[PDB]
Amino acid sequence: MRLTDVDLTVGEETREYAVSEQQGTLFRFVDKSGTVANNTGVFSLEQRFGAANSNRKVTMLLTDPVVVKDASGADMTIKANASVTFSLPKTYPNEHITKLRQTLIAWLGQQCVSDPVDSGLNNY
Amino acid sequence: MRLTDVDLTVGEETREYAVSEQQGTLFRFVDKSGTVANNTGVFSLEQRFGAANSNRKVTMLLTDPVVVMTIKANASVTFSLPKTYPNEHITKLRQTLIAWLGQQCVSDPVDSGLNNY
Amino acid sequence: MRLTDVDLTVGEETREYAVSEQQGTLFRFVDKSGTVANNTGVFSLEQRFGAANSNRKVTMLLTDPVVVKDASGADMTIKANASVTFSLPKTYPNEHITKLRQTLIAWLGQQCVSDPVDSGLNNY
Amino acid sequence: MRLTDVDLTVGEETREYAVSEQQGTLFRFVDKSGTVANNTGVFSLEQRFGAANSNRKVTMLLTDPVVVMTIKANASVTFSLPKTYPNEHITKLRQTLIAWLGQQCVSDPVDSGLNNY
Amino acid sequence: MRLTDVDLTVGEETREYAVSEQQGTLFRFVDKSGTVANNTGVFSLEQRFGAANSNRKVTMLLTDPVVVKDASGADMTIKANASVTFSLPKTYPNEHITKLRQTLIAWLGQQCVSDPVDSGLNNY
Amino acid sequence: MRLTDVDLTVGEETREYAVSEQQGTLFRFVDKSGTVANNTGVFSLEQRFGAANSNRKVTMLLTDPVVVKDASGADMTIKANASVTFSLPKTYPNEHITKLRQTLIAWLGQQCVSDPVDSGLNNY
Ligand SMILES: [Ca+2]
Ligand SMILES: [Ca+2]
């Protein structure tokens, strides 16, 4: 796809990203909320096409930094990371790859995934 | 939460998973539509809470096999979350990852292998 | 399955078990007839999911202790054990696994299985 | 007992086994519906009577192959019975094992691999 | 018992815990008023069922952390702990065990116990 | 507190203790239903007020002995023990200490605690 700046609907807010770099098998967006100096968010994606016996692999990194108060009171920046990796064999059909991606989105929506991620509570 | 069998709306289809194991920090669901062990897709999640200087880590593995021989494809997500980081911004992070996984610039390489240009 | 206390119909009596512990791949029931001190029966089940080349395995242990008179006359506790093990390859269909379990139940009902187990007589 | 061919009611089907060998302490039945040796399911039982200080042991092996290549799955039961232990309570033990093998908490891991939680 | 979230009546307030993990011999609750960042209370219990000769042990840990200002003004999180351990021999009857537990609750209510625990004053 | 004999309400019975010794940091009660020859219950509590850097510790031991017939018929006295220990840092406020003690009483009342303690069954 010809890359363009991206606007995501996130819960009840809208998040705007802009293309920061594009390579042959890699690209990176930056959250428009931020500066070179102070960064608000980054997203990166890279594909690694292996040999015909190897599975091709696709990896994403989403980084969200937030400024938090120090125990002394100083301003301190803290990052939270999320990383996804798709291992897709080259005999696997593209249809079922799409199915896989969508089921992952659905799972990431679920409360049984939300509670440990968002708040640290395990399910029982 | 109290684990219950889950039904996911996946595009225009409905996937139906059943709880297959629950440990202390780990759980595993299984695609009800599976006929054989190798036929059967699975989803597992585990949290590893670290020391106070560490970040807690949550990992998920989604396995979807298909018959061609049966071939398996994996998606794996990992959330590295520092403890001082606020729960609200964590919920934000998760939702934005969902949104990203929606986009074309992600589907084109994942689904069909087209890189962006 | 969400575990619950279990009541079994056994011949012409009813036997009541209660959940004693549940792990990820293991659980244990105890016969409600008994105490920590004096035990009347135990049942345990564990599953071992191997690698994709390995068969998954499922093992059950049923223990029935009985108090018997000593040759001197003292009270002595004697256990009898029964253990089942299902070796199920991961290319084997779940339907035929159910078929296998039910045929095993039927066989355990048979007189040709009952005579050696219950009384020690071999068949001829 | 005097061995005779056996017909088992298995769920909603009927399995039909024929006597295939009888030794002193060992016997073996065979699924009549088998077309080939590898196609054919089998069931075998053997008693090993020990010394007076030992427990007698009875072992059973049930083999059910299926064609996918033919793949074999095994169930094996073993009764360890002390001699002083009363025959009545042995009959009890066997019946309760049957009852247990009926239950969901046993079928879910055996049949489909779901652990209990 | 089928573990589920519990609410405790504590003097004239209500304390709400939620199941945070359940293992075979161990479980852990967390105070619902808390965060990973700012924890407010945890309770954990484990049973070590001993060898046939030994007693079985049950241990509980209750931890209540509180934020306190420092002499430097900095905010400092401080934990107070209570730990209970039941050593129960197998031959001991379940009835007298429940008796023991209830008498311990009664004692923990008494002023001769609360005064040294709560305020650090000894009895006389 | 001025130590005097106490009576505890235990379920639907009343348990009567009497002061057996009082020291500076330690005291001991004895169940009034007992003899030196046949003891029926003891409770003891000690505070180790720590160094200025350390936490102070309060420990309690409750012992309930019961007579049980032996397999040989002989009479055998068996003790069951409960031990509680409060580790309380100096900077921790007396208010939240009383909170901790009361929540421990509440927990000890709960079924998720009584079932493993009283009957040896784990939760699930
Ligand atoms: Ca370009
Ligand atoms: Ca459970």
CB distance A124–E35 less than 8 Å? Answer: no
Measured in Å, residue A45 CA sits from the centre of ligand 1 at 15
State the Cα–Cα distance between residues C54 and C51, nearest whole angstrom. 5
Rounded-to-integer distance, Cα C8 and Cα C23, Å = 22
Contact B36 C91 (CB under 8 A): yes
Q: Give a three-class secondary structure readout of E42-98.
A: EEEEEEECCCCCCCEEEEEEEEEEEEEECCCCCEEEEEEEEEEEEEECCCCCHHHHH
Q: What tokens appear for E85 in the block?
A: 């351990």
Beta carbons of A36 and A52 less than 8 angstroms apart:
no
The full 3-state SS of chain B, as one line of letters, equals CCCCCEEEEECCEEEEEEEEEECCCEEEEEECCCCECCCCCEEEEEEECCCCCCEEEEEEEEEEEEECCEEEEEEEEEEEEECCCCHHHHHHHHHHHHHHHHCHHHHHHHHHCCCCC
From chain E residues 23-82, the ones with a CB under 8 A of any chain A CB are 30, 35-36, 74-76
Number of helices (H), then strands (E), in chain C: 2, 6
> Interhelix angle for A94-109 vs B87-102, to 10°?
160
Of B19, B30, B34, Cβ closest to residue D117:
B19
Q: Give chains near B: 3+ CB pairs under 8 A.
A: A, C, D, E
Structure tokens of A48? Answer: 């690694």
Give the tokens for residue A41.
């968010």
Tokens for A59? 């990896």
Q: How far apart (Å, rounded) are the C-alpha atoms in residues D79 and F107? A: 43
**Resolution to 1 decimal, in Å?**
3.2
For residue C1, the distance in angstroms to the closest alpha carbon of chain B comes to 8
Nearest CA in chain F to E83: F85
Contact: E92, C37; criterion CB under 8 Å: yes
- Is residue B77 within 8 A of residue B59, CB to CB? The reply is yes
Q: Kindly give, in sequence order, each residue whose CB lies less than 8 Å from that of residue F65, ignoring residues fewer than 6 positions away.
A: F39, F40, F41, F77, F78, F79, F80
CB proximity D9 to B under 8 Å = no
Binding partners of F (≥3 Cβ pairs within 8 A)? C, E
Tokens of A97: 């790859």
Say if CB A17 and CB A41 are below 8 A apart: yes
Residues in CB range of C86: below 8 A, 6 or more apart = C57, C58, C59, C97, C100, C101, D73, D74, D75, D110
CA–CA dist D62, D10 (Å, integer): 14
DSSP F80-100: EEEEEEEEE-TTS-HHHHHHH
Contact residues for A35 (Cβ-Cβ < 8 A; gap 6+): none
Q: At what angle do helices E94-109 and F94-109 cross, to 10 degrees?
A: 160
Contact: C80, D76; criterion CB under 8 Å = no
Elucidation method: X-ray
Both tokens of C62, joined, read 């049923």
- On whether the CB atoms of residues D43 and D62 are closer than 8 A, the answer is yes
Task: State how far the alpha carbon of C75 is from the alpha carbons of A35, B85, D55, F71, in Å.
Answer: 83, 64, 19, 6
The 10 Å CB-count burial string (b at 16+, else e) for F82-95 is bbbebbbbeebeee
For the CA of C23, the nearest ligand: 2
Breaks (C-N over 2.5 A) in chain C follow: none
Q: How many CA atoms lie within 13 A of A41 on its CB side?
A: 22
Q: Bridge partners of F8?
A: F15
CB F115 within 8 A of CB F123: yes
Task: Check CB contact under 8 Å for E26 and B24.
Answer: yes
| A50 DSSP 8-state letter | -
> What token pair was written down for B115?
């890189």
What is the rounded CA–CA span in Å between residue E112 and residue E123?
Answer: 7
Q: How many CB pairs under 8 A join C and E?
A: 18
- Here the tokens at position A115 are 């509670």
Side chain identity at residue D28, one-letter code: R
Window 92-121 of C: residues touching B by CB (8 A cutoff) are: 92-95
β-bridge mates for residue F26, sequence order = F46
Q: How far apart, in whole angstroms, are the C-alpha atoms of residue D57 and residue F119?
A: 33
- Give which of C107, A118, D23 is closest to B47, Cα–Cα: A118
Answer whether F36's CB lies under 8 Å from F20's CB. no
Q: Which residues contact D55 (CB under 8 A, 6 or more apart)?
A: D80, D81, D82, D83
Question: Bridge-partner residues for E82, per DSSP?
Answer: E62, F86
Give the residue from E37, C58, C86, E43 showing the smallest Cα distance to A71. E37
Kindly tell me the burial class for residue A12, based on how many C-beta atoms sit within 10 Å of its own C-beta (0-12, 13-18, 19 or more): exposed
Q: Are A123 and B26 in contact (CB under 8 A)?
A: no
Of B23, B26, B37, the CB nearest to C90: B37
Q: Please state, in angstroms and rounded to a whole number, the distance separating the CA atoms of residues D86 and D71.
A: 40
CA gap F99, F86 in Å, rounded: 12
The dihedral over CA atoms of B106, B108, B110, B113, expressed in degrees to the nearest 10, equals -140
Q: Is A73 exposed, middle or buried (0-12, 13-18, 19+ CB in 10 A)?
A: exposed
**Cα–Cα distance for residue pair C47/C50, rounded to 1 Å:** 10
Q: Do F103 and E78 touch (CB under 8 A)?
A: no
Starting from the CA of residue A21, give the closest ligand. Answer: 1
> Which residues does residue B61 pair with via DSSP β-bridges, in sequence order?
B44, B76
Assess contact for B72 and A59: CB atoms under 8 A: no
Contact by Cβ (8 Å): E75, E65: no
> Among partner residues E6, E114, E124, which is closest to F3 by beta-carbon distance?
E124
Query: How many Å apart are CA A58 and CA B100, to the nearest integer?
Result: 14
Q: Which residues of C84-113 are buried (b: 16+ CB within 10 A; e: fewer)?
A: bebbbbbbbbbebbbbbbbbbbbbbebebb
How far apart are the CA of A119 and the centre of ligand 2, in A? Answer: 20
Residue D34 makes CB contacts below 8 A (sequence gap 6+) with: D40, D41
Answer whether A39's CB lies under 8 Å from A20's CB.
no
